[PDB]
RNA sequence: ACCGUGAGGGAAAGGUGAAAAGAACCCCGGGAGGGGAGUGAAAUAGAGCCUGAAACCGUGGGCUUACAAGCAGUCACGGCCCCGCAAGGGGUUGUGGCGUGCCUAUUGAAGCAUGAGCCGGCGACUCACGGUCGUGGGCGAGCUUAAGCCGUUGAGGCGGAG
RNA sequence: AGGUGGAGCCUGGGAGUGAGGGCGCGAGCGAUAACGUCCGCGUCCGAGCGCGGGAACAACCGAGACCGCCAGCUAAGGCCC
RNA sequence: GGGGGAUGACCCCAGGCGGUAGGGGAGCGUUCCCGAUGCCGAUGAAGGCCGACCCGCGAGGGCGGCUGGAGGUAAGGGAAG
C-alpha cells in the first residue's frame, strides 16, 4: 500500500474580519489555512490551501503597551541604514502590513512558503475583490 | 594419488601477514606500527634485549 | 468492500483480487493462507476490539521473493573507517481472493 | 616474477565512477571526487532510511488530526479514545481511511468518542 | 544523401575558428558563401575553403545539385598542439601552444520538394 | 642529442598489413587536407598507421533551469521523455524533509591548521644468516648431515668431519 | 555466602600507549581571576564529530547505531505558527 | 553457546555484533610455476566499451550485446617486483 496523495484540487477561498481579533492569535490560523493543514489530504510539497482574504485589518487590536513600545526594523545595505518603526506609526501609515508581517513570519521559509504568502490578500476596512466564493469565519 | 590430488594438511602452509595495503585488513596507513616516533622510524629502535 | 489485515508487524488495506507483497512467511507457492487476523470491514460498522473474531481473508502464496538490492554504506571521516554490505530482503507475494466474515 | 598494476586499478576506478553517474560536475567525472561524494551519499541514504520512517508517520498525523478536527476534536484525545476503546487498529498508516473512506473514519470517531464520555 | 569536407591540421586555434563556424550553420550554401567573405576574421578564409571543397564534393561526387544545398552540420575539433619555448624574465621560459584545428563542413539537400 | 669552461651530467624515442597490394585516375584546393575511384578479410588497419582506457575539447538528441542561497548529495511525491503485454524499470528534476568536503596531524578541524589543478602510468614491511615462540609432518634415546663424491629429458643417491 | 561473566587465575606469542581534554566533587598554587595550572575520586569525549534534546555546538540532558519496514511504546525535551 | 547426532554446514532455539592505536580470523583479486605433448579458441583469445541481468555480506565472479584480431589457460596446489 502506497500512501494516498492528491491530484489537482479545487482551490478554495475564505474570508476573515480581523476587527477586534487580536493578532498572532489571528495570524496563527491564517497560517494554517494558508497552508491548508486543516484539509486532511495534507501535502507538504504541494500548496493546496485556501486563499485567505482579510478586511477591517487596521482594526486589529493588540494587548500590552505594544502600540507605542513595539518596533519594526529595516536595514539598507548602507551605513546607519537601520530604520526603526513604532507599531502606531505603521498603523497610521500602512495599516495591515502588520498582519502581512505577522503572517509572513509564521509561513515557512522557502519557495513554497513564498507562494502561500501570495495567496494571502489583506485590505484595510471593508471590501475587496468580489470575484470568488469567500465564506467567513470568526 | 594424482598430481591434482596432492595439497598439504590444514596447517602447514599458513601464509602470511602483509600490511600496509587495505583499510580493512586493519594493517593499513601506519601499517601496524602506530603513529609514533623512534620505533616507527625505519631502522627503528636500539636493541631491546640490552 | 475492503479489509485491513495484519502481517509481519504491518497493516494493509486489501481488495479481493489484489496482488500484494508481504513480509515473507512459510507456505510453498500455491499453498493457501487464511490469516485468522483481520482488523476492519468495508461495509462499515464492524471494527471493534483488536480483531473481529471469526473473520479472516484468504490469499494464495504465489511465491517467495528477494527484493532488489539495497547498498548499505557506512563511512566515518578522519578515522579511516568504511564498511560495505549488500542487502536483499526476502518477501512473499500474495493474491487476495476473498474475505470471509 | 613481477606483477604490474595492469588492469586492476582501471577497473576499480571504473566501478565507482559508474555509481557516481549523474552527480554535478567533476563529482561524476573524477575517481577522487566521485569516491568522496559517494561516501556522503552512502551515509545520507542510510540516515534518511531511518528518517523516512519518521518522515512518513509525521504526515499521517497531520492528516488524521486535520480530518477529525472537522468532526471537532483533537488528535491527542482521538488516540486516547482509540486506545481505551481497544481499537488499536489505526496504525496511523491507514488515515488513507480518513481520506478514501470518510464514514469509516466517522464511525471510528464515535467508537473513540465513547470511551470516557 | 549528403557530402562532406574535412580540413585537418589547420594551424589555427579551435576557439577562434569555431566561432565563425557557428556563424554559418544551417544556412543555405548561398548565404553561407556570402557571409564568410564579408565576415572579418582570419578563420573565415579557412572555413570557406572547406565549405567549397564540400560543395564540389556534392555535385561532382554524390550527385547533389548545387542550388539545393544548405549546411546540415559543421564543427571544428582540436588537432595536436605545436609547442614552442618562450623565454622569459629572470631566465624563466614558458611554453606557448600553437593550436591546431580539424574543420568539418557537412552538406545536405534542402527539402526542395 | 642537450647542459656544463672543465672534471662531469645525461634523456626521450619500438608495433600498417598475411602481402605495399603504400591508394592510377577524376573533383575542391596555392600547397596541406579531403571527397569519389581502387586495394584489402578489415582502411575510424591510410603511413601523425595494432589495441585505442581516462583527464580534456566538440557536434547532435532527451529532461531541466532566468524570485532563489549553495560540501552539491540524499529520502519523498509529482511532471515530461524512453523501454516494456501488464504490474514494472531507466533518464531527467520541480517542490518538500535532512545534510559542516577527503586525507593528515591533534585535547579538539567544515575548519580561517598540512597535502592535493585533473587523468593515466611508477611508487613504500623484503631477503640472507642467526634466534625465539607457534603450527604441519618424519624419526624417536636419539635426531641429523656439511663441504665434497658418483649419477641425471628440471632423477637422484652417497657422504657421520661435525 | 550469592554472583557462569567478552568474568577470574596460571603459562607463553603479538602489540599499541607513555602530548590527553571537558565536566562534577574534593584540595593546593592563582586574585574565594582564566576555555588557568597541579594532584585525588568519578564520568564522558578521545575511539560514540553516529542518533534525539539543548536555535546552531567533542565531551550538558536522552541513549551504546548488525541489516531491512510507508508498524507500535517511550526517553530527554516538547504540544500558538 | 545448547539441543537434533549429519558427527558438525542444515534445523530449530537463545544470546552477543559503535569503535581510533592495536591483536586475532577468514576471503577476494594480480604476475609466475605444476596440472599441460592436455583443455578453450577465427562459429573469435587477451584487452577495451555498455548492461536495468544472475551469483556472492563484501573484495569479486557470471552472463548477454558491441569492439577487438591471437592468444588464453579449470578443478587442485606452489611462489611473489
Ligand atoms: Mg585497526
Ligand atoms: Mg589483523
Ligand atoms: Mg604491531
Ligand atoms: Mg604518520
Ligand atoms: Mg606522540
Ligand atoms: Mg634510526
Ligand atoms: Mg631488557
Ligand atoms: Mg564529518
Ligand atoms: Mg578524531
Ligand atoms: Mg603498483
Ligand atoms: Mg522511530
Ligand atoms: Mg620579457
Ligand atoms: Mg638571461
Ligand atoms: Mg598551462
Ligand atoms: Mg659542450
Ligand atoms: Mg592528394
Ligand atoms: Mg572490396
Ligand atoms: Mg575514407
Ligand atoms: Mg576500430
Ligand atoms: Mg584495425
Ligand atoms: Mg595518435
Ligand atoms: Mg597484428
Ligand atoms: Mg589506431
Ligand atoms: Mg575519449
Ligand atoms: Mg550540448
Ligand atoms: Mg520576493
Ligand atoms: Mg522560476
Ligand atoms: Mg549564487
Ligand atoms: Mg533537496
Ligand atoms: Mg595530508
Ligand atoms: Mg601538525
Ligand atoms: Mg598541532
Ligand atoms: Mg594544539
Ligand atoms: Mg584545508
Ligand atoms: Mg577553505
Ligand atoms: Mg597557514
Ligand atoms: Mg605542521
Ligand atoms: Mg593515479
Ligand atoms: Mg608495488
Ligand atoms: Mg622463525
Ligand atoms: Mg619448526
Ligand atoms: Mg616432532
Ligand atoms: Mg642417518
Ligand atoms: Mg563464592
Ligand atoms: Mg578481559
Ligand atoms: Mg600477554
Ligand atoms: Mg605525562
Ligand atoms: Mg593530567
Ligand atoms: Mg552540584
Ligand atoms: Mg577553572
Ligand atoms: Mg584545563
Ligand atoms: Mg578526567
Ligand atoms: Mg589521539
Ligand atoms: Mg567508552
Ligand atoms: Mg562538528
Ligand atoms: Mg541539535
Ligand atoms: Mg534543533
Ligand atoms: Mg548533539
Ligand atoms: Mg555527541
Ligand atoms: Mg550494540
Ligand atoms: Mg504515544
Ligand atoms: Mg520549541
Ligand atoms: Mg541473532
Ligand atoms: Mg566491531
Ligand atoms: Mg575447436
Ligand atoms: Mg596475461
Ligand atoms: Mg570483427
Ligand atoms: Mg571481449
Ligand atoms: Mg613494491
Write out the DSSP string of C65-90: EEPPPEEEEEEETTTTEEEEEEE--E
Give the C-alpha distances (Å, rounded to integers) separating E82 from E7, E86, E98. 17, 12, 5
Instruction: From A62, A72, A58, select the one nearest A17 (Cα to Cα).
Output: A58
The nucleotide whose C1' lies nearest the CA of D43 is F74
Instruction: From C7, C1, C22, C101, select the one nearest C54 (Cα to Cα).
Output: C101
Q: What's the CA gap between D68 and D63, in Å, rounded? A: 9
Please, which experimental method was used? X-ray
Q: What's the CA gap between E36 and E24, in Å, rounded? A: 8
Q: Does residue C87 lie within 7 Å of nucleic acid chain G, judged by its CB?
A: yes
Q: How many CB atoms lie within 10 A of CB D42?
A: 19
**Cβ-Cβ contacts under 8 Å for A127 (sequence gap 6 or more):** A55
Would you state the torsion angle of the CA atoms of residues D69, D72, D78, D82, taken in this order, to the nearest 10 degrees? -120
Give the C-alpha distances (Å, rounded to integers) separating E2 from D58, D112, E27, E57, E67. 62, 79, 15, 9, 14
Q: What's the distance, CA C45 to chain centroid? A: 25
C-alpha triplet B41, B42, B43: angle, nearest 5°: 105
Q: What's the CA gap between A38 and A31, in Å, rounded? A: 11
3 state SS of C33: strand
Residues of chain C positioned with their CB less than 8 A from the CB of D42: 71-75
Q: How many CB atoms lie within 10 A of CB C9?
A: 7
Give the C-alpha distances (Å, rounded to integers) separating C88 from C10, C11, C33, E6, E71. 19, 22, 24, 54, 54
Closest residue, chain A, to D59 (C-alpha)? A42
Instruction: Tell whether B48 lies on the interface with C, counting CB pairs under 8 A.
Output: no
Structural contact between residues E72 and E106, judged by C-beta atoms closer than 8 angstroms:
yes
* Polymer length of chain E: 113
The nucleotide whose C1' lies nearest the CA of B27 is H22
Q: What's the CA gap between D49 and B30, in Å, rounded? A: 35
* Secondary structure element (H or E) that encloses residue B16, with its range: none
Q: What's the CA gap between D84 and D87, in Å, rounded? A: 8
Q: What are phi and psi of B40, to 5 degrees?
A: -80, -30
Distance from CA of C62 to the nearest CA of B (A): 42
**Cβ-Cβ contacts under 8 Å for A82 (sequence gap 6 or more):** A73, A74, A75
Pairing of strands C3-6, C11-14: antiparallel
For cell 569536407, what's the residue? E5
Structural contact between residues E94 and E83, judged by C-beta atoms closer than 8 angstroms:
no
The verdict on whether omega for the bond into residue C91 sits within 30 degrees of 0, i.e. cis, is: no
Q: How many CB atoms lie within 10 A of CB D30?
A: 15
3 state SS of E4: strand
Q: What resolution in angstrom units was achieved for this structure?
A: 3.0
Q: How many CB atoms lie within 10 A of CB C11?
A: 19
User: Residue A108 has what DSSP assignment?
Assistant: P
Quickly give B41 CA vs F4 C1' distance in Å: 39
* Partner residues linked to A82 by β-bridges: A75
Around B11, how many Cα atoms within 13 Å sit in the side-chain half-sphere? 1
Closest by Cβ to D107, choosing from C2, C11, C47 = C47
Distance from CA of D77 to the nearest CA of A (A): 17
Structural contact between residues E109 and E69, judged by C-beta atoms closer than 8 angstroms:
yes
Chain F: positions less than 7 Å from a protein CB are 27-29, 31-36, 48, 53-60, 67-68, 71-78, 87, 89, 91-99, 101-106, 109-110, 118-126, 134-137
SS (H, E, C) chain A: CCCCCCCCCCCCEEEECCCCCCCHHHHHHHHHHHHCCCCCCCCCCCCCCCEEEECCCCCCCCCCCHHHHCEEEEECCCCCCEEEEEHHHHHCCCCCCHHHHHHHHHCCCCHHHHHHHHCEEECCCCCCCCCCCCCCCC
Q: How many helices and strands, by DSSP H and E, does chain C display? A: 0, 8
Quickly list H helices, A42-83.
Answer: 66-69
Q: What's the CA gap between D109 and E56, in Å, rounded? A: 86
Quickly give A16 CA vs F69 C1' distance in Å: 35
* Partner residues linked to C58 by β-bridges: C34, C98
Q: Does residue C73 lie within 7 Å of nucleic acid chain H, judged by its CB?
A: no
Sheet strand arrangement including E94-109: E2-10, E94-109, E69-86
End-to-end CA distance of chain B: 53
C-alpha cell at C45: 460498522
Distance from CA of C27 to the nearest CA of A (A): 22
User: The domain E2-110 is classified under which CATH number: 3.40.50.720, 3.40.190.10, 3.40.50.2000, 3.90.470.10?
Assistant: 3.90.470.10
Structural contact between residues A7 and A128, judged by C-beta atoms closer than 8 angstroms:
no
For cell 466564493, what's the residue? A133
Q: For chains D and A, tell me whether 3 or more CB atom pairs sit within 8 A of each other.
A: yes
3 state SS of D32: helix
C-alpha cell at A54: 482579510
C-alpha cell at C15: 481488495
Buried b (16+ CB within 10 A) or exposed e, D47-85: eeeeeeeeeeeebbebbbbbbbeeeeeebeebbebbeeb
Dihedral (CA of D26, D31, D35, D41) sign: positive
Pairing of strands A13-16, A51-54: parallel
Chain H: positions less than 7 Å from a protein CB are 19-27, 29-32, 34-36, 47-51, 53, 55-60, 74-81
C-alpha triplet E58, E60, E66: angle, nearest 5°: 50
Q: What's the CA gap between E88 and E90, in Å, rounded? A: 7
Amino acid at each position: 500500500m502506497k500512501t494516498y496523495v492528491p491530484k489537482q484540487v479545487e482551490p478554495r477561498w475564505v474570508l476573515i474580519d480581523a476587527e477586534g481579533k487580536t493578532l498572532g492569535r489571528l495570524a496563527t490560523k491564517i497560517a494554517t489555512l494558508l497552508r491548508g493543514k486543516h484539509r486532511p489530504d495534507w501535502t507538504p510539497n504541494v500548496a493546496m490551501g485556501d486563499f485567505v482574504v482579510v478586511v477591517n485589518a487596521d482594526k486589529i487590536r493588540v494587548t500590552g503597551k505594544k502600540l507605542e513600545q513595539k518596533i519594526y526594523t529595516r536595514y539598507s545595505g548602507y551605513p546607519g541604514g537601520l530604520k526603526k518603526i513604532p507599531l502606531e506609526k505603521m498603523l497610521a501609515t500602512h495599516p495591515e502590513r502588520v498582519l502581512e508581517h505577522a503572517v509572513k513570519g509564521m509561513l515557512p521559509k522557502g519557495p513554497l512558503g513564498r507562494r502561500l504568502f501570495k495567496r494571502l490578500k489583506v485590505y484595510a476596512g471593508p471590501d475587496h475583490p468580489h470575484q470568488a466564493q469567500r465564506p467567513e469565519k470568526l | 594419488m594424482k598430481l591434482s590430488d596432492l595439497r598439504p594438511n590444514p596447517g602447514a602452509n599458513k601464509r602470511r601477514k602483509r600490511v600496509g595495503r587495505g583499510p580493512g585488513s586493519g594493517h593499513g596507513k601506519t601499517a601496524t606500527r602506530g603513529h609514533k616516533g623512534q620505533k616507527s622510524r625505519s631502522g627503528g629502535l636500539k636493541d631491546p634485549r640490552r | 468492500m475492503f479489509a485491513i489485515v495484519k502481517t509481519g508487524g504491518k497493516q494493509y488495506r486489501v481488495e479481493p483480487g489484489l496482488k500484494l507483497r508481504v513480509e515473507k512467511l512459510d507456505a510453498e507457492p500455491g499453498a493457501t493462507v487464511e490469516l485468522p487476523v483481520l482488523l476492519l470491514g468495508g461495509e462499515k460498522t464492524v471494527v471493534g476490539t483488536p480483531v473481529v473474531e471469526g473473520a479472516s481473508v484468504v490469499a494464495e502464496v504465489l511465491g517467495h521473493g528477494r527484493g532488489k538490492k539495497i547498498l548499505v554504506s557506512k563511512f566515518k571521516a578522519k578515522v579511516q573507517y568504511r564498511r560495505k554490505k549488500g542487502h536483499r530482503q526476502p518477501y512473499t507475494e500474495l493474491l487476495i481472493k476473498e474475505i470471509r466474515g | 616474477p613481477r606483477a604490474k598494476t595492469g588492469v586492476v586499478r582501471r577497473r576499480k576506478h571504473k566501478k565507482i565512477l559508474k555509481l557516481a553517474k549523474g552527480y554535478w560536475g567533476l563529482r561524476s567525472k573524477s575517481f577522487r571526487k566521485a569516491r568522496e561524494t559517494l561516501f556522503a551519499a552512502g551515509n545520507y541514504a542510510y540516515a534518511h532510511r531511518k528518517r523516512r520512517k519518521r518522515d512518513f508517520r509525521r504526515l499521517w498525523i497531520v492528516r488524521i488530526n486535520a480530518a477529525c478536527r472537522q468532526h471537532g476534536l483533537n488528535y491527542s484525545t482521538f488516540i486516547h479514545g482509540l486506545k481505551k476503546a481497544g481499537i488499536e487498529v489505526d496504525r496511523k498508516n491507514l488515515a488513507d481511511l480518513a481520506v478514501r473512506e470518510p464514514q469509516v473514519f466517522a464511525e471510528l470517531v464515535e467508537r473513540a468518542k465513547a470511551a470516557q464520555g | 544523401m549528403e557530402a562532406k569536407a574535412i580540413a585537418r591540421y589547420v594551424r589555427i586555434s579551435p576557439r577562434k575558428v569555431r566561432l565563425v563556424v557557428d556563424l554559418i550553420r544551417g544556412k543555405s550554401l548561398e548565404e553561407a558563401r556570402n557571409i564568410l567573405r564579408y565576415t572579418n576574421k582570419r578563420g573565415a578564409y579557412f572555413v570557406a575553403k572547406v565549405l567549397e571543397s564540400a560543395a564540389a564534393n556534392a555535385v561532382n561526387n554524390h550527385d547533389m545539385l548545387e542550388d539545393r544545398l544548405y549546411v546540415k552540420a559543421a564543427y571544428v575539433d582540436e588537432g595536436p598542439a605545436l609547442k614552442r619555448v618562450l623565454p622569459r624574465a629572470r631566465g624563466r621560459a614558458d611554453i606557448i601552444k600553437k593550436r591546431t584545428s580539424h574543420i568539418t563542413v557537412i552538406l545536405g539537400e534542402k527539402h526542395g520538394k
